[PDB]
Amino acid sequence: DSTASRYASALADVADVTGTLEATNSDVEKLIRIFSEEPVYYFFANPVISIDNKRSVLDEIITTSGLQPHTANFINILIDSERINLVKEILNEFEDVFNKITGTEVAVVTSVVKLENDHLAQIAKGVQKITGAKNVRIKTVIDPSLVAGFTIRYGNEGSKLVDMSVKKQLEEIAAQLEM
Amino acid sequence: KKNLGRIAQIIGPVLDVAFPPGKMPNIYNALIVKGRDTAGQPMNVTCEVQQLLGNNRVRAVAMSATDGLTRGMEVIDTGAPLSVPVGGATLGRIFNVLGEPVDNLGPVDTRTTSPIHRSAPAFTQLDTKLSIFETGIKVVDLLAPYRRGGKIGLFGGAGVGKTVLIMELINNIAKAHGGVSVFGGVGERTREGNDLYMEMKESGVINEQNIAESKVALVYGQMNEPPGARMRVGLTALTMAEYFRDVNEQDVLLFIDNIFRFVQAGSEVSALLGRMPSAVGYQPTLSTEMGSLQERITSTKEGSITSIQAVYVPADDLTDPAPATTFAHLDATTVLSRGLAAKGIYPAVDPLDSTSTMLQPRIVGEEHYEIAQRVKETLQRYKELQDIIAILGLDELSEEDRLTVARARKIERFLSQPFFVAEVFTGSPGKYVGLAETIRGFQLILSGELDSLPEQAFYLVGNIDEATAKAMNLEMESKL
Amino acid sequence: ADEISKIIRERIEGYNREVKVVNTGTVLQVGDGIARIHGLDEVMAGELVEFEEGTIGIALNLESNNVG
Ligand SMILES: Nc1ncnc2c1ncn2[C@@H]1O[C@H](COP(=O)(O)OP(=O)(O)O)[C@@H](O)[C@H]1O
């Protein structure tokens, strides 16, 4: 495991023991869109800034968006330890550990064109029947490089891949050269 | 290209720059840095990417001076692996590693550029005509013959030879080989390079009048350069030779000296680059980098690149990896020994260890092979009787073995040559001797037929008849 | 996101302008020998910094966060 993965596993474990896992996931999405937009990251980093000013501004940002307290507790502990500079990576791996704990799996269906929602749910049926996740989430990405079909990037993170696409030509022609 | 850089960190010569995520240069892809100098704005220091760190930033060793660079400078990548101008333009000019002229004359044309770091030539087309060369040195033309169209190693300690020997060899062969010459000053002292440049412009090889008439094209990445430049000066010389072997189809003789610097600079940048240290302190990719240089030098069915690298065996560490992997690549190794320059026998080439893949009889001549065998066996006998001589008195060994010791002494003095370029250190005029004359000399010397001359009549002597005359002169001035 | 947080955004950009002045840097670590200042995005390698105590220092190591 990575340090970001450990901290994210802590946050997901607390959001597991307290029945606020979905609210905490939404709160992490809010917090990662906060810790994007560099100047905020630059402020919470830069150890020249005094710790009291940092925690005060963090309290203000907490009471602004109405976060869950244990997630606010998580960011405040991140400020306590010197590991606040990993905050983007921790909030990024939170999605992984949260999907693993709540039991759902992500399948990024990348096709040439946007896909119908019922047929996307059919893709979710299939991916679920090979993975075995409860609420399989499908975030689709329109792509111009593909030609007719689609690619699925289900798995841990990109790990498994099935694609009926320009890869059809690519494999037929890797077997056409035959050297 | 157009990929603006924003240099993140500058840790010594190795600087790592954070490109945008999509547009990222490849490995060994040049990066001209749009930066300011210590005074005055325009200053482009060239960097070649070594690896990609994955945080959108690549690590790039800097070919030029590293000071003055700030964190955050815009840099752009050429997209081409550091193109170097070669061909009919590169003649006569001392060239920088960047691909620039250094001798303050007019800039060259870039109509015949070429990538410096390219694929090695395939084994499918490999010209190997085993043939001997007459360089001029008594010992190295007899004991360790040199393979033209092949690689030659002038190994030695610190100051044993290997640069005066290279100067003598170039003074001999620069006129003999109708093909062009290429000198790669890989980490050699700047004053010896300038001595070489003066010697070349005086000996007609440069011919500064019409600079398109030179039989040579120099490349100097000499000592006073950041370890990027010493990491690629060898490859610049290699690109010039590879053009002269791809296009002009002529047998180009390239000289590299202190090729060990092409491994030392790699070490100095590799330690910084995050790559872990290998054995005694060089880079981990010693073998691959050394091979990536020394494999491009092969006669490749359009011409024959004979090359003479002067490896620097550091502190006479014959087991050091930087010469130990070069002994694998080098055909006609000539291990110069400090212990033989101790007693003044110049050149201090070891008669034993200087060995060649061209001392096979079908390749060299049966008479040549038998005389080289007898000379090397006599010197091995002398080395094995050194300890008996050292302690138990010279006389207490065998009487026939005493004949062998006197013969070995006469041999290991006679294989000393008065060079033309070393006339300043000896005071005696330089003498050139072919292979045939020294062969006939060694015959009568070791045959015991003229075992009556004095020893100093064989030392620092061009030929056997010169030795006989020197014995007359010496015996006359002895009594008189 | 931070639409209502415009005031705290002005506050944090104010704190950044407090700590991040150009040609300026703050000494995180000062070991026996070297120091490790934070900042100096303007500095060149080998440039002489002045420590505002009267102790000159040369900057040989430019890492990402801290200039050594
Ligand atoms: N033929 C020779 N006669 C006299 N001295 C020599 C001869 N060959 C080498 N030397 C001495 O040994 C040195 C070898 O040359 P040098 O460039 O120092 O070798 P390296 O490049 O290995 O340091 C010369 O400086 C010279 O003093």
CB B143 within 8 A of CB B378: no
Q: Is B233 helix (H, G, I), strand (E, B) or coil?
A: helix
Ligand 1 atom with the shortest distance to the CA of B192: 17
Straight-line distance from the first to the last Cα atom of chain A, in angstroms, rounded to the nearest whole number: 41
For residue B161, what is the DSSP state? S
Q: Which residues contact A83 (CB under 8 A, 6 or more apart)?
A: A3, A7
Q: Do chains B and A touch (3 or more CB pairs under 8 A)?
A: no
Distance between CA atoms of residues B335 and B152, nearest Å? 11
Do the domain assignments include residue C50? yes
Taking CA atoms, B451 is separated from B337, B446, B472, in Å, by: 27, 8, 14
> Tokens 């020394």 map to which residue?
B294
The CATH number given to whatever domain includes residue C45 is 2.40.30.20
Sign of CA dihedral A165, A168, A171, A174: negative
**Cβ B67–C45 below 8 Å, yes or no?**
yes
CB B270 within 8 A of CB B287: no
Nearest CA to ligand 1 atom 22: B159
Q: How far is the CA of B295 from the centre of ligand 1 (A)?
A: 29
Ligand 1 pocket: which of B164, B188, B258 to mutate (most atoms within 8 A of CB): B164
Q: What residues of C are in contact with residue A40 (Cβ under 8 Å)?
A: 2, 9, 12
Do the domain assignments include residue C10? no
Ligand 1 pocket: which of B167, B425, B431 to mutate (most atoms within 8 A of CB): B425
Q: Which residues contact B103 (CB under 8 A, 6 or more apart)?
A: B93, B94, B197
Q: How many CB atoms within 10 Å of residue C19?
A: 19
Domain covering B359-478, topology: 1.10.1140
Taking CA atoms, B214 is separated from B163, B198, B202, B284, in Å, by: 22, 14, 12, 40
Among C8, C38, C39, select the one facing A57 at the smallest CB separation. Answer: C8
Instruction: Give me the catalytic one of B57, B93, B148, B188.
Output: B188
Do the domain assignments include residue C24? yes
CB C37 within 8 A of CB C28: yes
CA distance C47 to chain B (A): 7
Q: Domain residue spans in chain A?
A: 1-103, 104-179
Q: DSSP letters of B112-151?
A: TEEESS-PPPPTTS------EE--S-HHHHHTS-EETTSE
Q: Domain residue spans in chain B?
A: 1-81, 82-358, 359-478
Spell out which residues line ligand 1, taking CB within 6 angstroms.
Answer: B 156, 158-164, 192, 346-347, 419, 422, 425-426
Residues B30, B35, B41, CA angle at the centre, nearest 5°?
135
Counting the structural domains of chain C, the total is: 1
Sign of CA dihedral B78, B79, B84, B89: negative
What Rg, from alpha-carbon coordinates, does chain B have? 25
Question: Of B397, B415, B406, B336, whose CA–CA distance to B158 is shortest?
Answer: B336
**DSSP collapsed to 3 states, A141-165:** EECCCCCCCEEECCCCCCCCCEEEC
- For B9, the token pair is 């960190």
**Cβ C15–A30 below 8 Å, yes or no?**
no
Catalytic residue check, B23: no
Distance between CA atoms of residues B375 and B442, nearest Å? 8
**Cβ C62–B71 below 8 Å, yes or no?**
yes
Q: What residues of C are in contact with residue A49 (Cβ under 8 Å)?
A: 15, 19
Q: Please tell me whether B410 is known to bind a ligand.
A: no
Q: DSSP letters of chain C?
A: --STTHHHHHHHHHHHHHH--TT-EEEEEE-SS-EEEEE-TTPBTTPEEE-SSS-EEE--EE-SSEE-
Q: How far is the CA of B409 from the centre of ligand 1 (A)?
A: 22
Q: How many CB atoms within 10 Å of residue A104?
A: 15
Q: Any long-range contacts for A118-127 (C-beta under 8 Å, 24+ apart)?
A: A123/A152, A127/A152, A127/A154
CB B278 within 8 A of CB B290: no
Catalytic residue check, B192: no
Do the domain assignments include residue C3? no
Among A34, A48, A49, select the one facing C1 at the smallest CB separation. Answer: A34
Do the domain assignments include residue C9? no
Sign of CA dihedral B175, B176, B182, B186: negative
Assign residue B296 a region: left if phi > 0, alpha if psi is -120 to 50, beta otherwise?
Answer: alpha
Identify any residues that bridge with B52 across adjacent strands, giving them in sequence order. Answer: B58
Q: Which residues contact B182 (CB under 8 A, 6 or more apart)?
A: B216, B217, B218, B219, B237, B240, B241, B244, B252, B253, B254, B255
- Put simply, whether B12 touches C (Cβ < 8 Å) is yes
Task: For B391-465, list the strands marked E by DSSP.
Answer: none
CATH code, B82-358: 3.40.50.300
- For A49, the token pair is 């800034």
Q: With both helix axes pointing from N to C terminus, report the angle between B435-446 and B399-414 in degrees, rounded to the nearest 10.
A: 160
CB B173 within 8 A of CB B253: yes
- Put simply, whether B68 touches C (Cβ < 8 Å) is yes
Domain covering B1-81, topology: Thrombin, subunit H (2.40.10)
Distance between CA atoms of residues B256 and B237, nearest Å? 8
Among A33, A42, A57, select the one facing C11 at the smallest CB separation. Answer: A57
Residue numbers followed by a gap, chain A, C–N over 2.5 Å: none
- For B198, the token pair is 């003066």
> What residue numbers bound the domain in which C31 lies?
20-68
CB B253 within 8 A of CB B177: yes
Q: Do chains B and C touch (3 or more CB pairs under 8 A)?
A: yes
Amino acid B137 reads I
Do the domain assignments include residue C53? yes
What is the signed CA dihedral for B295, B296, B299, B305, rounded to 10 degrees?
-110
Distance between CA atoms of residues B459 and B100, nearest Å? 46
